[PDB]
Design a protein around this nucleic acid. Structure first.
Ligand code: MET
Ligand SMILES: [K+]
Ligand SMILES: [K+]
Ligand SMILES: [K+]
Ligand SMILES: [K+]
Ligand SMILES: [K+]
Ligand SMILES: [K+]
Ligand SMILES: [K+]
Ligand SMILES: [K+]
Ligand SMILES: [K+]
Ligand SMILES: [K+]
Ligand SMILES: [K+]
Ligand SMILES: [K+]
Ligand SMILES: [Mg+2]
Ligand SMILES: [Mg+2]
Ligand SMILES: [Mg+2]
Ligand SMILES: [Mg+2]
Ligand SMILES: [Mg+2]
Ligand SMILES: [Mg+2]
Ligand SMILES: [Mg+2]
Ligand SMILES: [Mg+2]
Ligand SMILES: [Mg+2]
Ligand SMILES: [Mg+2]
Ligand SMILES: [Mg+2]
Ligand SMILES: [Mg+2]
Ligand SMILES: [Mg+2]
Ligand SMILES: [Mg+2]
Ligand SMILES: [Mg+2]
Ligand SMILES: [Mg+2]
Ligand SMILES: [Mg+2]
Ligand SMILES: [Mg+2]
Ligand SMILES: [Mg+2]
Ligand SMILES: [Mg+2]
Ligand SMILES: [Mg+2]
Ligand SMILES: [Mg+2]
Ligand SMILES: [Mg+2]
Ligand SMILES: [Mg+2]
Ligand SMILES: [Mg+2]
Ligand SMILES: [Mg+2]
Ligand SMILES: [Mg+2]
Ligand SMILES: [Mg+2]
Ligand SMILES: [Mg+2]
Ligand SMILES: [Mg+2]
Ligand SMILES: [Mg+2]
Ligand SMILES: [Mg+2]
Ligand SMILES: [Mg+2]
Ligand SMILES: [Mg+2]
Ligand SMILES: [Mg+2]
Ligand SMILES: [Mg+2]
Ligand SMILES: [Mg+2]
Ligand SMILES: [Mg+2]
Ligand SMILES: [Mg+2]
Ligand SMILES: [Mg+2]
Ligand SMILES: [Mg+2]
Ligand SMILES: [Mg+2]
Ligand SMILES: [Mg+2]
Ligand SMILES: [Mg+2]
Ligand SMILES: [Mg+2]
Ligand SMILES: [Mg+2]
Ligand SMILES: [Mg+2]
Ligand SMILES: [Mg+2]
Ligand SMILES: [Mg+2]
Ligand SMILES: [Mg+2]
Ligand SMILES: [Mg+2]
Ligand SMILES: [Mg+2]
Ligand SMILES: [Mg+2]
Ligand SMILES: [Mg+2]
Ligand SMILES: [Mg+2]
Ligand SMILES: [Mg+2]
Ligand SMILES: [Mg+2]
Ligand SMILES: [Mg+2]
Ligand SMILES: [Mg+2]
Ligand SMILES: [Mg+2]
Ligand SMILES: [Mg+2]
Ligand SMILES: [Mg+2]
Ligand SMILES: [Mg+2]
Ligand SMILES: [Mg+2]
Ligand SMILES: [Mg+2]
Ligand SMILES: [Mg+2]
Ligand SMILES: [Mg+2]
Ligand SMILES: [Mg+2]
Ligand SMILES: [Mg+2]
Ligand SMILES: [Mg+2]
Ligand SMILES: [Mg+2]
Ligand SMILES: [Mg+2]
Ligand SMILES: [Mg+2]
Ligand SMILES: [Mg+2]
Ligand SMILES: [Mg+2]
Ligand SMILES: [Mg+2]
Ligand SMILES: [Mg+2]
Ligand SMILES: [Mg+2]
Ligand SMILES: [Mg+2]
Ligand SMILES: [Mg+2]
Lengths: 107, 166, 140, 95, 191, 80, 97, 148, 20
RNA sequence: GCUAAACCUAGCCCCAAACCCACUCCACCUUACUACCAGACAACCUUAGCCAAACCAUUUACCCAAAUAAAGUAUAGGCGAUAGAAAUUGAAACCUGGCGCAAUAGAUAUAGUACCGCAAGGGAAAGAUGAAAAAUUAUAACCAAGCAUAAUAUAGCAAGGACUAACCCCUAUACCUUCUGCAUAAUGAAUUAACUAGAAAUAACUUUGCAAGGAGAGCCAAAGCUAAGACCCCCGAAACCAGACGAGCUACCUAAGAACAGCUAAAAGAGCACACCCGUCUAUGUAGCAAAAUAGUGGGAAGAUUUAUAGGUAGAGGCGACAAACCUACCGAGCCUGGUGAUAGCUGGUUGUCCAAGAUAGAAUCUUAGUUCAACUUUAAAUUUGCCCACAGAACCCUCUAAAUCCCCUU
RNA sequence: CUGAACUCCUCACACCCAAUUGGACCAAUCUAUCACCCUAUAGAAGAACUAAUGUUAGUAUAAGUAACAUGAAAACAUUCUC
RNA sequence: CUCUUACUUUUAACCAGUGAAAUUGACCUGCCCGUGAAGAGGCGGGCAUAACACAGCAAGACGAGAAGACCCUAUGGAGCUUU
């Protein structure tokens, strides 16, 4: 509910969009499994989608680390210092691409 | 059971820098398995809370409750423990920082009622915890004055905004 | 094969995390908390209808207060602004009353002028042209 | 009805159904009219002829008797000179 | 599942010790009414709906279905380059290290299933090598099964085994419905 | 003792989170944390601001006097 | 409470031991062996459950018929009562008639 | 399960019980529809279309005498002596298109079926088999394993 | 009506005899 | 911060295999565990009943020694419920295993012990360091309810919308069950942890195999047949029966004992009145001192008295100066065990998430607290009209010359 | 003029009936095979509790309430009161 | 009893020691009128309203206790009697 959760006023970071627009997403850290079945969609994203995504976002540094893991995750770090970790466990390539694009558009 | 209070006297702080302020000495002491009720022991623990080491002993010495002697004995051995072991210069330079009672392990016994019925009574036990901090006791908080009330009220009136608008 | 629930702790905490700010045993005892948490969620859903209802009532009260400062009643201001083909809603008018008093007085004067033009039209037999502010812009 | 017998663990057949009804292999059940041998002196010949007819059962009664009899009575029989042989199969039946 | 027997069993309220007498009178005690102390509601009572072992899960697929499963598994191995054909299973040496290196050199994967025509006529060289290995298993042609083929990455069949498999599997495609079990004598069976 | 591993594993992570809240670790440089490439981050710094920075000049901008003296001290301590 | 504070010891499963490596072997003994032996003859267990399946009532009836004379007096009494209860439950109680 | 009543508790009456009303399967008068059913002789029909079909595929050899053993061996008919079967009956179905000349031994044969066989020059004979011999003649191999 | 007397039920003695 | 929490073993379950077990000395059927004296006493004998038939009265499955099949067939039966063969048929059979439990589980079991009962009998609870305790200032911590650190400020199912702000403002009649309808002052619930409740045939449907054949003898077959998936709860009576155990309480009886001051009369089922026996009335007590008592007042107190000890009568019974008394605190007929998981159309309860369709004329019934068939509702499938309705049409007898209905193309 | 979850507006849409019925998913556990900071595809079953005057255990509430106890002095010898 | 009063003991209340039981959905637990499953601390309209102990009282919480013994129902029992 609203009473049981914190609240804030609408705002931006460094008055973003006033003088110029700066992409608030700063870093993406992917953790994919070479053999993990739950990382099948994550591997598909790396093979064909992350390379094109890096072209469209030169200001975002993307780290893809291939290590054994049961639940693949993507960590998004922003300029204001907020860190958000999202799971891509058993997600298709389209769902991962939508999730990654959602992280890029957030402040 | 838990015995974390006895382990709080084993913390060794790093040496202070020459410019750092003096750190008050903290002494933790307790007595386990006291044949007394924690509810009755709470009033005695509440009474001496915040008092100096000497004033607490004076109040407990002339108190008719049984736990007063037990608490006074705990303070006496805690006061000696501070000077002998915790490097406290003056034995009177202590005040009661924390003092409270806790439930201990109890034994259940049968109480016989009429008509062949019964009730289960417990042989109550309690723990007494005390913390001594070196230095004069902190002064009591002065009562809130009319100036403080008026200043707070005006601050409330100066912090209200136009709600549900731009 | 005997199966037992090994993660019942996490099931309980999903309900108790929403009751942490409650008062009494119903913030820590699941049997009592679950009934109140469900009611809290139901009240949250039903309050969205009242939030819209209360906001419009608040806007009407604020508009009525500002209208009376200019000697106009709320129905006169709202009705005549419609006749001027001005589609400002009550949310904007309430904002204009608080932060743009000079603009709101012009809106009040415009509604007052349109209100007077309606009175002249009613008294007139119809052999006179429409009021200057009574003209309606036709769209096709 | 005995769904699981105590000695074989199999469904049993209610023998009251067997002594009264004939099941054609098409799924129909044939019965005789109740009271066709009772008080014939007070019944008109038109009424008595209807009582002597061999009538069929409806869907509910046919389904009820299927549950009360085992699969032995639903098998296809090739009795020699069977009077009801021609009625065991349907002809020109739609839906 | 066809050869699985579950030995798990629990005692119902009629098999737990005691519980014959009603614990207290039906009315007047102020407590909930109970008729036995071994009821499933009670601590230490019987189990309402628990395992009633031993339980058998025996069922048989049609003979042609189980015969067809071998054909599908054999086809999958050939289609995925997981099937290899050998003239014989004889090895130059009985050292198991030779067989492991041979599979690695030919890229046979982690596990290899070796099938010979008959158990008695298995070469001694391959038997010694496979007995000391865990991922290399030697079975007779009669012992071929879907589970073993699926568990092992690579399937190895001898030329006599291939002819043996074709005769046995294709016999189901052009056979009459049985009048009696095929163990009994037939005019043209076996062979 | 209930059979299983996932429930015990899940509870361990909850305990680790609570321990961090009780005793927060001191903040450390993002470079010391994993997933850091200084050269990659420098290039993205210019691209976010839509500025054609010179890599030679931009890298020297983040080099402070205190860092150089500390780096020299470390080499002397290790005898390099 | 109700959940362990430490991880259980790790589960070490030898996927390639002799039992798992040779599981399923000879399941086609009838098909590939001139039908000399039925695959049901490979089942090892209770003598009243080799190549046979049934519900609880059918198992209790079959066990009493085959090894009822070899059972202990207390075990036989419980089996007899179980058949009586199962007879009443299956043939008299239930949602469907 | 429902709300109360015998439904939820599961104590509803037996199948066929109609709440105390005289049930349908009882109020109907008894008649001898199935009286003596277990003592009626049954004969598996064998149409000349079926017989001609077997010969054209080589499942039944017309150059040798045809009896119950040959019909079962060719999987032409299925005989169940335990189910009161007494052999096969040669029926007249497909007599128009029947052309093979065979020596067939059956248990029953209609007048038209006999004529169709004899038109092509074949011989048809009706022979009786008691239940013991019927099982032996249909499956000789199981009998020969009895040592009798 | 008949007398309705419910005799008291003594709990087992061991539950009130445990010691440290 | 306490209280606590956590654990992996003890062992156990179901099978296979294999046919177990008794005695150092001494004691032990009398009052068992008692060194040493006249016996002649000696075993056999249909189970019943709950329950099902919706009552109940005939009747109602209970290993009887080869898996399968014949077959749920012959047959039996208030020909109802239900019971149920045989001839014949003829297979496999390598103990050392586990999609069994892990301290409320698995045996009741650490133990038939503690404890309870006169007896038969009933019947528990629990443990947790480490390689080393001849390392005990050791093995850190965080986790239920309950508390403490830290009582409380107008107003209200205690929350929600919110808000600069905890409250103040606005909105809001806990939950389950049961009902025509419950905030209901109807039911259950102090709270926490653990435990605790949907078992299966008949067909049908869905998905494979093969196909006039299917199936690893039996069976089915006018596209069938084989295989799989998928539907059927928990607690509770008062009772009935069988076999044991009980007259150390009480009812009465048997053998052999004991008690009854003083006074009057001296004769006493006589009077006054202790011990003693009983329990009239009142108060107190009502989880009490007491599962029937205390205080006072009373009845009897040489008699049909009271009472100690041992014995007898046992539940289809005993015993009874009949109160339906009393028979081990609860006797319209004891208690324990077993049948027994008795039965209950009656009550209560019935455990994860999400969506969808969904309120229904009657008939019969020892039946109206329930069921079965219709009706209604649900799913799947087939193919063709369904609903709304234009004229024309549907009764005379009769006081309401009714609102309407039925039929019905078009649309 | 005010006034609904009616209707319109921006976006989205399977996302408000008891009994009952259909359907899509799924926690934990065991097993096959993967996986290897806790998962996947399947096969299995003692497979999920805010309620049964539910069972067992812990601890509250009533409640520090009801209730319970030791004649007096003294040298602890002794004496005194009843 | 008119018509009660005084004193003593016990209880009582306070201090110290020990320490039960039924009960308990959650309670942040007012009054009036009206309403409503027909008798409201919780709903509607008003009124009242800083917080928190202790001792009394018994009008209410349809107060606690005992799955009403009265009544009816059950094709539920049982004792007794009988042409
Ligand atoms: C009427 O008199 C009824 N209350 C019965 C009284 S005796 C239990
Ligand atoms: K136990
Ligand atoms: K049934
Ligand atoms: K309830
Ligand atoms: K009720
Ligand atoms: K009411
Ligand atoms: K009510
Ligand atoms: K009531
Ligand atoms: K007493
Ligand atoms: K006696
Ligand atoms: K009823
Ligand atoms: K006086
Ligand atoms: K009162
Ligand atoms: Mg207590
Ligand atoms: Mg049982
Ligand atoms: Mg029992
Ligand atoms: Mg009994
Ligand atoms: Mg109670
Ligand atoms: Mg019972
Ligand atoms: Mg148990
Ligand atoms: Mg119910
Ligand atoms: Mg009903
Ligand atoms: Mg039930
Ligand atoms: Mg019944
Ligand atoms: Mg002895
Ligand atoms: Mg009956
Ligand atoms: Mg009766
Ligand atoms: Mg008959
Ligand atoms: Mg009947
Ligand atoms: Mg146990
Ligand atoms: Mg043991
Ligand atoms: Mg806590
Ligand atoms: Mg309010
Ligand atoms: Mg309100
Ligand atoms: Mg009512
Ligand atoms: Mg209402
Ligand atoms: Mg109330
Ligand atoms: Mg209520
Ligand atoms: Mg009621
Ligand atoms: Mg309770
Ligand atoms: Mg089922
Ligand atoms: Mg089923
Ligand atoms: Mg109960
Ligand atoms: Mg009887
Ligand atoms: Mg008897
Ligand atoms: Mg006696
Ligand atoms: Mg005598
Ligand atoms: Mg005398
Ligand atoms: Mg006298
Ligand atoms: Mg006496
Ligand atoms: Mg007397
Ligand atoms: Mg006298
Ligand atoms: Mg006797
Ligand atoms: Mg007498
Ligand atoms: Mg009398
Ligand atoms: Mg009387
Ligand atoms: Mg008694
Ligand atoms: Mg029952
Ligand atoms: Mg009944
Ligand atoms: Mg709907
Ligand atoms: Mg009748
Ligand atoms: Mg009815
Ligand atoms: Mg119509
Ligand atoms: Mg029409
Ligand atoms: Mg509106
Ligand atoms: Mg809306
Ligand atoms: Mg919508
Ligand atoms: Mg999962
Ligand atoms: Mg799974
Ligand atoms: Mg369960
Ligand atoms: Mg729980
Ligand atoms: Mg409960
Ligand atoms: Mg207390
Ligand atoms: Mg006191
Ligand atoms: Mg009180
Ligand atoms: Mg007192
Ligand atoms: Mg006293
Ligand atoms: Mg005294
Ligand atoms: Mg008092
Ligand atoms: Mg209590
Ligand atoms: Mg209670
Ligand atoms: Mg308040
Ligand atoms: Mg208040
Ligand atoms: Mg009122
Ligand atoms: Mg009010
Ligand atoms: Mg008070
Ligand atoms: Mg009451
Ligand atoms: Mg009252
Ligand atoms: Mg009642
Ligand atoms: Mg009466
Ligand atoms: Mg009655
Ligand atoms: Mg009735
Ligand atoms: Mg009866």
């Amino acid at each position: 509910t609203a009473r049981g959760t914190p609240s804030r006023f609408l705002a931006s970071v460094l008055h973003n969009g006033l003088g110029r627009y700066v992409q608030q997403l700063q870093r993406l850290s992917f953790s994919v499994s070479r053999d993990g079945a739950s990382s099948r969609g994550a591997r598909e994203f790396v093979e064909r989608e992350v390379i094109d995504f890096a072209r469209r976002n030169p200001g975002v540094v993307i780290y893809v680390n291939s290590r054994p893991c049961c639940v693949p995750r993507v960590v998004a770090e922003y300029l204001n210092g907020a860190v958000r970790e999202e799971s891509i466990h058993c997600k298709s390539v389209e769902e991962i691409s939508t999730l990654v694009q959602k992280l890029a558009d957030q402040s | 059971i838990s015995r974390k209070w006895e382990k709080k006297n084993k913390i060794v702080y790093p040496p202070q820098l020459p410019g750092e302020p003096r750190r008050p000495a903290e002494i933790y002491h307790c007595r386990r398995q006291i044949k007394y009720s924690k509810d009755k022991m709470w009033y005695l623990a509440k009474l001496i809370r915040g008092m100096s080491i000497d004033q607490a002993l004076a109040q407990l010495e002339f108190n008719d409750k049984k736990g007063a002697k037990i608490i006074k004995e705990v303070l006496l051995e805690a006061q000696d423990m501070a000077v002998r072991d915790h490097n406290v210069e003056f034995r009177s330079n202590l005040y009661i920082a924390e003092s409270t009672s806790g439930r201990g392990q109890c034994l259940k016994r049968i109480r016989y009622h009429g008509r062949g019925r019964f009730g289960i009574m417990e042989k109550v036990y309690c723990h007494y915890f005390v913390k001594l901090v070196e230095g004069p006791p902190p002064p009591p908080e002065p009562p809130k004055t009319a100036v403080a009330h008026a200043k707070e009220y005006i601050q409330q009136l100066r912090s209200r905004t136009i709600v549900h608008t731009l | 094969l005997r199966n037992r629930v090994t993660d019942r702790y996490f099931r309980i905490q999903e309900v108790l995390k929403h009751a942490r700010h409650f008062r009494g045993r119903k913030n820590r005892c699941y049997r009592l908390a679950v009934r109140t948490v469900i009611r809290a969620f139901v009240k949250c859903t039903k309050a969205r209808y009242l939030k819209k209802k209360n906001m419009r009532t608040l806007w009407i009260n604020r508009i009525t207060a500002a209208s009376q400062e200019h000697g106009l009643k709320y129905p006169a201001l709202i009705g005549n602004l419609v006749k001027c083909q001005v589609e400002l809603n009550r949310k904007v008018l309430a904002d204009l009353a608080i932060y743009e008093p000079k603009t709101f007085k012009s809106l009040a004067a415009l509604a007052s002028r349109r209100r007077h033009e309606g009175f002249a039209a009613a008294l007139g037999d119809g052999k006179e042209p429409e009021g200057i502010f009574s003209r309606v812009v036709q769209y096709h | 009805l005995t769904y699981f017998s105590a000695r074989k663990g199999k469904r049993k057949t209610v023998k009251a159904v067997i002594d009264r009804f004939l099941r054609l292999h098409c799924g129909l059940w044939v019965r005789r009219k109740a009271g066709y041998k009772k008080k014939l002196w007070k019944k008109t010949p038109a009424r008595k002829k209807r009582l002597r007819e061999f009538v069929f059962c409806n869907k509910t009664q046919s389904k009820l008797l299927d549950k009360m009899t085992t699969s032995f009575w639903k098998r296809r029989n090739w009795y020699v000179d069977d009077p009801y042989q021609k009625y065991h199969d349907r002809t020109n039946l739609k839906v | 599942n066809f050869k699985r027997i579950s030995y798990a069993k629990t005692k119902t309220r009629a098999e737990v010790r005691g519980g014959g007498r009603k614990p207290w009178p039906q009315k007047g005690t102020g407590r909930a009414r109970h008729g036995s102390i071994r009821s499933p509601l009670w601590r230490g009572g019987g189990v309402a709906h628990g395992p009633r072992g031993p339980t058998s899960y025996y069922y048989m697929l049609p003979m042609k279905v189980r015969a067809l499963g071998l054909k599908v598994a054999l086809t999958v191995k050939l289609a995925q380059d997981d099937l290899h054909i050998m003239d014989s299973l004889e090895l130059p040496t009985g050292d198991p290290q030779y067989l492991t290196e041979l599979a690695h050199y030919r890229r046979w994967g982690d596990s290899v299933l070796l099938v010979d025509l008959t158990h008695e006529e298995m070469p001694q060289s391959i038997v010694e090598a496979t007995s000391r290995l865990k991922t290399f298993n030697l079975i007779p042609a009669v012992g071929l099964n879907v589970h073993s083929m699926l568990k092992h990455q690579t399937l190895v069949l001898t030329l006599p085994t291939v002819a043996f498999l074709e005769d046995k599997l294709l016999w189901q495609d052009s056979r009459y419905r049985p009048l009696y079990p095929f163990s009994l004598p037939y005019s043209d069976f076996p062979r | 003792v209930k059979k299983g591993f996932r429930a015990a594993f899940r509870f361990q992570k909850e305990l680790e989170r609570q321990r961090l809240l009780r005793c927060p670790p001191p903040p450390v440089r993002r470079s010391e944390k994993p997933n850091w490439d200084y050269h990659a981050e420098i290039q993205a710094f210019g691209h976010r601001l839509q500025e054609n920075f010179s890599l030679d000049l931009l890298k020297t901008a983040f080099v402070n006097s205190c860092y150089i003296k500390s780096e020299e001290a470390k080499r002397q301590q290790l005898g390099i | 409470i109700g959940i362990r504070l430490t991880l259980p010891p790790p589960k070490v499963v030898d996927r390639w031991n002799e039992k798992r490596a040779m599981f399923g072997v000879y399941d086609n003994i009838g098909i590939l062996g001139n039908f000399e032996k039925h695959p049901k003859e490979l089942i090892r267990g209770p003598i009243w459950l080799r190549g046979w399946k049934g519900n609880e009532l059918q198992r209790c009836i079959r066990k009493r018929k085959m090894v009822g004379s070899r059972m202990f007096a207390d075990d036989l009494h419980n089996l007899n009562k179980r058949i009586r209860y199962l007879y009443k439950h299956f043939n008299r109680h239930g949602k469907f008639r | 399960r429902g709300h109360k009543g015998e439904r939820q508790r599961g104590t509803r009456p037996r199948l066929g019980f109609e709440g105390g009303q005289t049930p349908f399967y009882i109020r109907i008068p008894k008649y001898g529809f199935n009286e003596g059913h277990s003592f009626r002789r049954q004969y598996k029909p064998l149409s000349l279309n079926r017989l001609q079909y077997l010969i054209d595929l080589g499942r039944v050899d017309p150059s040798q005498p045809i009896d119950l053993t040959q019909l079962v061996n060719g999987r032409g008919v299925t005989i169940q002596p335990l189910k009161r079967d007494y052999g096969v009956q040669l029926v007249e179905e497909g007599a128009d298109t029947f052309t093979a000349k065979v020596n067939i031994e059956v248990q029953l044969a209609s007048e038209l079926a006999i004529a169709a066989i004899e038109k092509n020059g074949g011989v048809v004979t009706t022979a009786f088999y008691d239940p013991r011999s019927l099982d032996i003649v249909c499956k000789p191999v199981p009998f020969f394993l009895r040592g009798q | 009506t008949k007398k309705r007397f419910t005799p008291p039920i003594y709990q087992p003695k061991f539950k009130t005899e445990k010691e440290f």
